[PDB]
Design a protein around this ligand. Structure first.
Ligand SMILES: [Mg+2]
Ligand SMILES: [Mg+2]
Lengths: 235, 231, 222, 250, 233, 211, 244, 240
């Protein structure tokens, strides 16, 4: 056939480029970073009404100060999360402190290109890693299967990503509040989702310095959705 | 064509296409410039962002107090190679109480890259490196290609549109080599060199990355408002 | 039979002030009844405003210091040039020591610096990795000669206020760097008189927010 | 380096055929004819010494080989494959039997060990099957005289008499007409020589024919005296003269 | 773990104003047997370093080969092997000290006591000790074995501290070293009269002196010594 | 050294001395012999301080990872078991560890003794160290399940004092901890020298000692 | 490198089938038919040797029926050499169990073990599967008399009566027609031979083309006896049942 | 060792080996899981192409992983045994190291992890198996039902079906299963499970297996006659 670590004539790794196509088929995940916190939101996308939607876990805690959202082949994310949690806790063991968000992200991205003929293929999932540390404040990173990670003020991944990213391009500014970010994620999720957005098929979360990483209750999110509907009807 | 499926295969004309494709990844990468005098050596790098919300990808990596490099191509491969350099620099210090010569560092990088071009299963590195350093024989600038070829130069550039900066340095050769004991003027020449590779975009405060090493100057990277002075 | 361990003598002393810290140690290196060197530095600046001394078997002490200095270097590389706090350094050293739990570094180690609130800090280690923060700690050969004196003159132990007759303790007033250095010098001058492995010279490293400063004093050479 | 062929080179085709085994059998078919006949008091195995050149000393090339003192082997197909199988068969008779039980293995079990080796070359990674069919003749106390065929697949069958290689189809028909359950060893040798003449084109004599027997114990070939229970090997290779003597009574 | 078989006794050394001096006798003892009389225990590395070794001779010969290989390896792909990137005393010492400590940490030591004497690129004197335990120390005077007990006291009378080094000439330093070697010959039962002496000076380079002998010895007073107390004859 | 811990109506008390000796020489007057694994788990320490510190801080890592994976706080039984299984790996190697794992989980307050042998015992009361026999005497004669938090704290405090007085290798100061379902609560450092005279006067005990 | 020559023996087809397993089953369909019939008082194993010769030494020959231990036997369909590898492994497993628990291995446990080995070759290793299908006839004190089959996929199932090898479609229909639950060994013996006689590709069914075995509690009192039939005994039972 | 990357991405971002493993599941006999208010029922299809089968000894479709958790599947039978064995070992390993039995979710997560591992490890192919894992957590009376598939994804279901014609029985369950009021009793839960299989099965004879799992390690498999009574009652109500 051909090597798994083969370069194309254009100078790209075939397998890495193909894994990016798998991520495009994944459900939408959006992250928005503010000076009051970073918000993470995901489309759950249940394949059937009999599937209990609260068992869909596409937003995950890595540490008290770091959260993570996923898009693509979500089964691949489990070992990445396990490594991230181990790296975060191990650093606390060695250094009696919280680990930097960038250092955590870099540790996850080191796994990415460990494939060949190590694992047999790249990961088929992209991660939005959000967190806070004392040195660089609130941060949002986009970790890819290429091993590359970009920091973002706001980022969307998944099937509705380019439409959402264009929307995030217009909406984001450096003075956003946490509440404004929450509604903004909900607004853009509602725009790109196939089914009508509600508290059962969409999930919110955030990371603040005080309270750390928190996944939002369906009751809490439902109120924010109702608040969104009213403010859009307000003009 | 039929001979580019893996790195272990020569073409009928004696070419290694996988290595050439890895070389192509460097050409897609953002421009970075290297140049030196007899007292200092300078790296200048144009960082690239994903979009307006994103950060600008870091291009320069410190290897020791007296050595470091800039990258163009696959960033993770630069991290692997720079980590290797950090270890080798460190082995020399711990075992021999000796700072690693820049020329020897180049020889080590050449040999590491070479092993990936002759064996089955692996792939060539998809990144180019510009290594600067100051050792017992003064200032140095190296250009690394993932073919294994390492070259000691007065100045150079790699990445997209790097030919413009390279021609400029070829003209300015006699001038910038003489900039001794003046770090700011040497950086200026590097910033002017990398400017010959720009189109549509210009050098902004979070776009530009500069590093310097010299006689009484540890390897230090300048980003953010620290490079506004040179814009 | 080959004995991989040895005893190079020496004595060290770390005292934590209110906004400073000192780590002192004699410069004499010995084996048995012979002097190897009258000036062989034992306390080192490891960077990030941290000073360190591994007293006991010099070969293991030099190896541990060398490794910790290396751990500082890689902490910078791995975590975006972040400053290594004294408490993080202490925890890291625990793991360096316990990696040899079954073939230990035969050294009693002390580090000194400032905590993240700017206050003086001293951490003390045993050969196998147990550690804890302290205000005052003497280590090495003449540790037993010095510590009782420091309990008395630094923490005012067994000292009460005249007139009360044991009812009111002497209040724990803070000491200046000049006061601490006097106690350090008198500690080593006294140790030098009654301990044969202590002498030749005394080197003190003082740590403040401004950085690391050194002071050297002669001791008796007999 | 490293052997990176850790996958099977013999695989089932859509029709259920194991190609490499079939092709190994084709190589055996091209090989020189060899045969075996079992008598009441012995077994004979025989083949043609197809000399590649007249300058070659064909005595130095042994197609019929002693495996144990009471077991012998002959082949058809690829000679080098046979030679290494004989080396392995001799060794396995010691390692997996004699060093355990203090005696040589019975014919059927040594055949079983050889068969296993050949089967493994049909399934293990990065190897082709052996391109030989073996005829193994032997004797042991509890089973008596026996003759076995072993194919490239590792399958083995016991025979009263059989032939393999070039003219096996014609030779097996010839043996069917002549064989009975009352043959003496000398009768089997006579039939072997008759059968073998049909497949031989050129010279037919003791120097161009290789023939051995499993028969009576040979105390003259033991090499020592003093132990009553040790009576000598039952395997014996016939000399060039001994073959020619029987070709006059042919 | 082993035991030393063929051994070399004291190595002595000291710093002076423009360089260092190092000396060691030419004997290879086999217990109390003075077996080998032509053993060179001072091994020069280039033109700026001399490594003096005591203890096990088979291990000394091994170290000698490591140093020889070090010079070969340093020259590889090194245009400045005879200039800026030549081996320094500090490089050579640190390498040996790394090896010695690693070997003791595997419980298979090189049964030696080593003194590396030399002059650095910048003209600084280098003098440092390392032994089978990986223990290192530096001093204006350094000596191994018996030399530590008898030579150091004499050499320290010349250079008692760092400030005495600039005041000490090569003639005074060599004289002190030569006297110390005589004292060791009087008092060390595993010493020989023949020795080697090396001077590494920042101006005059490496001067290696072979086939030296202890001379000007005092023995005449022995004729008057009779008995062990009461005997007069 | 003297450490104890016991279960009672409103949780578990944990009390320890503070002395460390190198032969007859008192190397430390103030070591922390309680390890704050996490906000709901405590570990006392006897034996080698390094083994206790290292393996129990590593236990905290495992307990935190457990909570992240399962989204639920680890039990005292499971935590104590993880620790005992670490010990069994270095079984025979020479580790020295004797600690009480104290906590509050679903089954209520919990207390497990764990040592280097791999022993793991559930119980209402434990005491380890060179002065444990003295502490057991005070505990056994005054312990009830019906104890108030105030009286229980004093009991553990008084039991350490008993050991500190008689045992030469126990003393310095007393560290108290109270473990609730909302987490552990630190109840201070108490100098034995000052505590002895205080208790002697108020309680009338230690008549034989002149004060 | 080596990848070029890799057939990839352990992959799914687009339809979700294992190529090599399917092709191994195709191979087995050309092997001599083997039949197993379970009765209330024992089990019968009957099998057809493939186009034999008159010069084949039948009385010392074994290509179909093998003994695993005193309580369990197997009938083989496919590559005989492949079968012997598995058979020896099964014999060792039975003895391992006996050594460990001091009890004879239950039939299913042995069957599961061999079937797991077959399975492994279809999922990992990159080797061709064993081209073998087994019929297991055995007895233990839990389930009594048991028949199982396993094929190259590593899948195994229990049966009252079953065939493997050639003409299993025709054979299974004939067995399904005449089999009853209250059947006895002597009746099962007859059914097996009658089924082979009708499904055989040969002109006539004779003793030299058959291997036969029974597992009976027809052993003196509460115990089980395995009987591998001799050539003369197969000739007698053929006359008794009225086939020759 | 054999290290060949069998599960790899294609240009369109698909891992065909994982997708072809799902086709093996599609071929497998139908399995269904329905959780009531105080129980979970696992129904399984038995294809009647195989008669003369010995049902005493033939591997049953539902397997106990522990005394309180069960596992059924659709797909390759041989593959499922490996997952079952691993699950059973992990269940005992958990009891031994943590002193509590596994939760149903934990056991599911483990099995799903094994399946995932076999989609990006060298030299191995994915499991051609989807599983339904059901039971009750220790000292808990809330029913649990999970599903896993070759890719390694898993999720909780009020009711779910896998295997051949699972599209049809899922269609039935989606219109017949009410979340606000799940089958209140064991009877209602079993009845709904049998009804769902009768949409696909053929004959309601020995083709339907039913296993009821109740809290506190109360697991029982229904017999032919017990199931036959459900089959009888369903069609008699249907004749109207
Ligand atoms: Mg003194
Ligand atoms: Mg006491």
């Amino acid at each position: 056939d051909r090597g798994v670590s083969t370069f194309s004539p254009e100078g790209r790794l075939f397998q890495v480029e193909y894994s990016l196509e798998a991520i495009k088929l994944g459900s939408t995940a959006i992250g928005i970073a503010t000076k009051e916190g970073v918000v993470l939101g995901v489309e759950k996308r249940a394949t059937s009404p009999l599937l209990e939607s609260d068992s869909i876990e596409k937003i995950v805690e890595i540490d008290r100060h770091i959260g993570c959202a996923m898009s693509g082949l979500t089964a691949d994310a489990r070992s990445m999360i396990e490594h991230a949690r181990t790296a975060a806790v191990t650093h606390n063991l060695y250094y009696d402190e919280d680990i930097n968000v960038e250092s955590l992200t870099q540790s996850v991205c080191d796994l990415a290109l460990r494939f060949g003929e190590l694992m047999s293929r790249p990961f088929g999932v992209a991660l939005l890693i959000a967190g806070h540390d004392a040195d660089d404040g609130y941060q949002l990173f986009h970790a890819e299967p290429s091993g590359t990670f970009y920091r973002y003020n706001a980022k969307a991944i998944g099937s509705g990503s380019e439409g959402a990213q264009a929307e995030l391009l217009n909406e984001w500014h450096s003075s956003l509040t946490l509440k404004e970010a929450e509604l903004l994620v909900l607004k853009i999720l509602k725009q790109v989702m196939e089914e009508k957005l509600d508290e059962n098929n969409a999930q919110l979360s955030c990371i603040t310095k005080q309270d750390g990483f928190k996944i939002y209750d369906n009751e809490k999110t439902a109120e924010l959705i109702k608040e969104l509907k009213e403010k859009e009807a307000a003009e | 064509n039929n001979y580019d499926g893996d790195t272990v295969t020569f073409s009928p004309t004696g070419r290694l296409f996988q290595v050439e494709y890895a070389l192509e990844a460097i050409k897609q990468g953002s421009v970075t410039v290297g140049l030196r005098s007899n007292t200092h050596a300078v790296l200048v790098a144009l960082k690239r962002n994903a979009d307006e919300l994103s950060s600008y990808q870091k291009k320069i990596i410190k290897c020791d107090e007296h050595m470091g490099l800039s990258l163009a191509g696959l960033a993770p491969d630069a991290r692997v190679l720079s980590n290797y350099l950090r270890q080798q620099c460190n082995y020399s210090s711990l075992v021999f109480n000796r700072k690693l010569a820049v020329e020897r560092a180049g020889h080590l990088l050449c040999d590491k890259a070479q092993k990936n071009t002759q064996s089955y299963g692996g792939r060539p590195y998809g990144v180019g490196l510009l290594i600067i350093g100051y050792d017992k024989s003064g200032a140095h600038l190296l250009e690394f290609q993932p073919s294994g070829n390492v070259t000691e130069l007065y100045g150079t550039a790699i990445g997209a549109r790097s030919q413009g900066a390279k021609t400029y340095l070829e003209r300015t050769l006699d001038t910038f080599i003489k900039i001794d004991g003046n770090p700011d003027e040497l950086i200026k020449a590097g910033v002017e060199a990398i400017s010959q590779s720009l189109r549509d975009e210009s050098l902004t405060v979070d776009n530009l990355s500069i590093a310097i090493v010299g006689k009484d100057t540890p390897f230090t990277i300048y980003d953010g408002e620290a490079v506004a002075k040179y814009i | 039979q080959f004995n991989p361990y040895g005893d190079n003598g020496g004595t060290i002393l770390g005292i934590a002030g209110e906004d400073f810290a000192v780590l002192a140690g004699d410069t004499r290196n010995i084996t048995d009844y012979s002097i190897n060197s009258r000036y062989e530095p034992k306390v080192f600046d490891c960077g990030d405003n941290i000073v360190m001394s591994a007293n006991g078997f010099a070969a293991d002490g030099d190896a541990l210091v060398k490794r910790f200095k290396n751990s500082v270097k890689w902490y910078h590389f791995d975590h975006n040039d972040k400053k290594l706090s004294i408490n993080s350094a202490a925890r890291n050293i625990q793991h360096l020591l316990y990696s040899r739990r079954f073939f230990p570094y035969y050294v009693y180690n002390i580090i000194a610096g400032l905590d993240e609130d700017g206050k003086g800090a001293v951490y003390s280690f045993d050969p196998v990795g147990s550690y804890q923060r302290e205000q005052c700690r003497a280590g090495g050969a003449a540790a037993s000669l010095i510590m009782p004196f420091l309990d008395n003159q630094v923490n005012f132990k067994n000292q009460y206020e005249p007139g009360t007759n044991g009812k009111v303790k002497k209040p724990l007033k803070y000491l200046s760097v000049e006061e601490v250095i006097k106690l350090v010098r008198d500690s080593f001058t006294s140790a030098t008189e009654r301990h044969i492995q202590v002498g030749d010279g005394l080197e003190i490293l003082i740590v403040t927010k401004d950085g690391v400063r050194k002071e050297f004093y002669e001791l008796k050479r007999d | 380096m490293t052997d990176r062929y850790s996958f099977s080179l013999t695989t089932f085709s859509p029709s259920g055929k194991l190609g490499q085994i079939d092709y190994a059998l084709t190589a055996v078919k091209q090989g020189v004819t060899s045969l075996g006949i079992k008598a009441t008091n012995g077994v004979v195995i025989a083949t043609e010494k197809k000399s590649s050149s007249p300058l070659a000393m064909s005595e130095t090339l042994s197609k019929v080989s002693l495996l144990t003192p009471d077991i012998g082997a002959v082949y058809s197909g690829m000679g080098p494959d046979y030679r290494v199988l004989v080396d392995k068969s001799r060794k396995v008779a010691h390692t997996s039997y004699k060093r355990i039980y203090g005696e040589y293995p019975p014919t059927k079990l040594l055949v079983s060990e050889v068969a296993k080796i050949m089967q493994e070359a049909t399934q293990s990674g990065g190897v082709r099957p052996f391109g030989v069919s073996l005829l193994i003749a032997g004797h042991d106390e509890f089973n008596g005289f026996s003759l076995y065929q072993v194919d490239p697949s590792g399958s083995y069958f016991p025979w009263k008499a059989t032939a393999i290689g070039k003219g096996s189809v014609a030779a097996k028909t010839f043996l069917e007409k002549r064989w009975n359950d009352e043959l003496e060893l000398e009768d089997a040798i006579h039939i072997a020589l008759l059968t073998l003449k049909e497949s031989v084109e050129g010279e037919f004599n003791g120097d161009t024919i290789e023939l051995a027997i499993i028969g009576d114990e040979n105390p003259d070939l033991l090499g020592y005296t003093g132990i009553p229970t040790d009576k000598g090997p039952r395997f014996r290779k016939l000399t060039s003269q001994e073959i020619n003597d029987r070709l006059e009574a042919l | 773990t082993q035991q030393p078989i063929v051994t070399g006794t004291s190595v002595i050394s000291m710093k002076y104003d423009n360089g260092v001096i190092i000396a060691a006798d030419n004997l290879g003892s086999y217990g109390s047997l003075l077996r080998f009389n032509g053993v060179e225990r001072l091994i020069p590395v280039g033109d700026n370093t001399v490594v003096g070794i005591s203890g096990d001779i088979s291990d000394m010969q091994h170290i000698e080969r490591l140093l020889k290989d070090l010079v070969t390896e340093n020259a590889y792909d090194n245009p400045l092997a005879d200039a800026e990137e030549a081996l320094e005393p500090s490089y050579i010492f640190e390498y040996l000290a790394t090896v010695m400590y690693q070997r003791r940490s595997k419980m298979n030591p090189l049964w030696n006591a080593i003194i590396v004497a030399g002059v650095q690129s910048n003209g600084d004197q280098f003098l440092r000790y390392v032994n089978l335990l990986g223990v290192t120390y530096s001093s204006p005077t350094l000596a191994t074995g018996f030399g530590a007990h008898m030579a150091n006291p004499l050499l320290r009378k010349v250079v008692d501290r760092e400030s005495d080094i600039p005041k000490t000439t090569v003639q005074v330093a060599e004289e002190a070293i030569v006297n110390a070697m005589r004292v060791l010959y009087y008092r060390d039962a595993r010493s020989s009269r023949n020795f080697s002496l090396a001077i590494i000076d920042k101006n005059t380079g490496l001067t290696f002196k072979k086939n030296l002998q202890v001379e000007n010895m005092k023995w005449d007073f022995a004729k008057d010594i009779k008995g062990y107390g009461t005997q007069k004859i | 050294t003297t450490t104890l811990a016991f279960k009672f109506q409103h949780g578990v008390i944990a009390a320890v001395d503070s002395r460390a000796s190198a032969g007859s020489y008192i190397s430390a007057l103030r070591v922390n012999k309680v390890i704050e694994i996490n906000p709901y788990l405590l570990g006392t320490m006897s034996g080698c301080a390094a083994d206790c510190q290292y393996w129990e801080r590593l236990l905290a890592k495992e307990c935190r990872l457990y909570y992240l994976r399962n989204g639920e706080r680890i039990s005292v039984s499971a935590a104590s078991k993880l620790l005992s299984n670490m010990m069994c790996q270095y079984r025979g190697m020479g580790l020295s560890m004797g600690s009480m794992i104290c906590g509050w989980d679903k089954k209520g307050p919990g207390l497990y003794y764990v040592d280097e042998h791999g022993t793991r015992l559930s119980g209402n009361m434990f005491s380890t160290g060179s002065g444990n026999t003295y502490a057991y005497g005070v505990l056994d004669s005054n312990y009830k399940w019906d104890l108030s938090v105030e009286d229980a704290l004093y009991l553990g405090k008084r039991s350490i004092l008993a050991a500190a007085h008689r045992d030469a290798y126990s003393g310095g100061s007393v560290n108290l901890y109270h473990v609730t379902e909302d987490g552990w609560i630190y109840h201070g450092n108490h100098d034995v020298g000052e505590l002895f005279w205080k208790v002697k006067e108020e309680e009338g005990s230690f008549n034989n000692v002149i004060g | 490198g080596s990848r070029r020559y890799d057939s990839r023996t352990t992959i799914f087809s687009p339809e979700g089938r294992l190529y090599q397993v399917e092709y191994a089953l195709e191979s087995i369909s050309h092997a001599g038919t083997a039949i197993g019939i379970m009765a209330s008082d024992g089990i019968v194993l009957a099998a057809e040797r493939k186009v034999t010769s008159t010069l084949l030494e039948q009385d010392t020959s074994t290509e179909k029926l093998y003994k695993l231990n005193d309580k369990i036997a197997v009938a083989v369909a496919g590559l005989t050499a492949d079968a012997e590898i598995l058979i020896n492994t099964a014999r060792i497993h039975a003895q391992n169990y006996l050594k460990t628990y001091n009890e004879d291995i239950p039939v299913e446990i042995l069957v599961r073990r061999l079937s797991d080995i077959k399975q492994g070759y279809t999922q990992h290793g990159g080797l061709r599967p064993f081209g073998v299908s087994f019929i297991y006839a055995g007895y233990d004190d839990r389930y009594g008399y048991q028949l199982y089959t396993s094929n190259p996929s590593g899948n195994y199932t229990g049966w009252k009566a079953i065939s493997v090898g050639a003409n299993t479609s025709a054979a299974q229909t004939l067995l399904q027609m005449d089999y009853k639950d209250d059947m006895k060994v002597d009746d099962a013996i007859e059914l097996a031979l009658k089924t082979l006689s009708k499904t055989t590709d040969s002109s006539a069914l004779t003793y030299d083309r058959l291997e036969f075995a029974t597992i009976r509690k027809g052993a003196n009192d509460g115990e089980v006896y395995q009987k591998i039939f001799k050539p003369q005994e197969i000739k007698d039972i053929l006359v008794k049942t009225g086939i020759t | 060792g054999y290290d060949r990357a069998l599960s790899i991405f294609s240009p369109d971002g698909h891992i065909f080996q994982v997708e072809y493993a799902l086709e093996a599941v599609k071929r497998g006999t139908c399995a269904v899981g329905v959780k009531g208010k105080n129980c979970v029922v696992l129904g399984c299809e038995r294809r009647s192409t195989l008669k003369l089968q010995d049902t005493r000894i033939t591997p049953s479709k539902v397997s106990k992983i522990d005394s309180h958790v069960v596992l059924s599947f659709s797909g390759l039978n041989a593959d499922s045994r490996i997952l079952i064995e691993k699950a059973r070992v992990e269940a005992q390993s958990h009891r031994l190291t943590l002193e509590d039995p596994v939760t149903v979710e934990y056991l599911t997560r483990y099995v799903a992890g094994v399946q995932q591992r076999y989609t990006q490890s060298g030299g191995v192919r994915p499991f051609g198996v989807s599983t339904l894992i059901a039971g009750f957590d220790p000292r808990d009376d809330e029913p649990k039902l999970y599903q896993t598939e070759p890719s390694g994804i898993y999720s909780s279901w009020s009711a779910q079906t896998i295997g051949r014609n699972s599209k049809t029985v899922r269609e039935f369950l989606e219109k017949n299963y009410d979340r606000k009021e799940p089958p209140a009793t064991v009877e209602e839960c079993v009845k709904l499970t049998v009804r769902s299989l009768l949409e696909v099965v053929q004959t309601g004879a020995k083709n339907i297996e039913i296993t009821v799992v109740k809290p506190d390690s109360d697991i029982v498999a229904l017999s032919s006659e017990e199931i036959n009574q459900y089959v009888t009652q369903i069609e008699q109500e249907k004749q109207e």
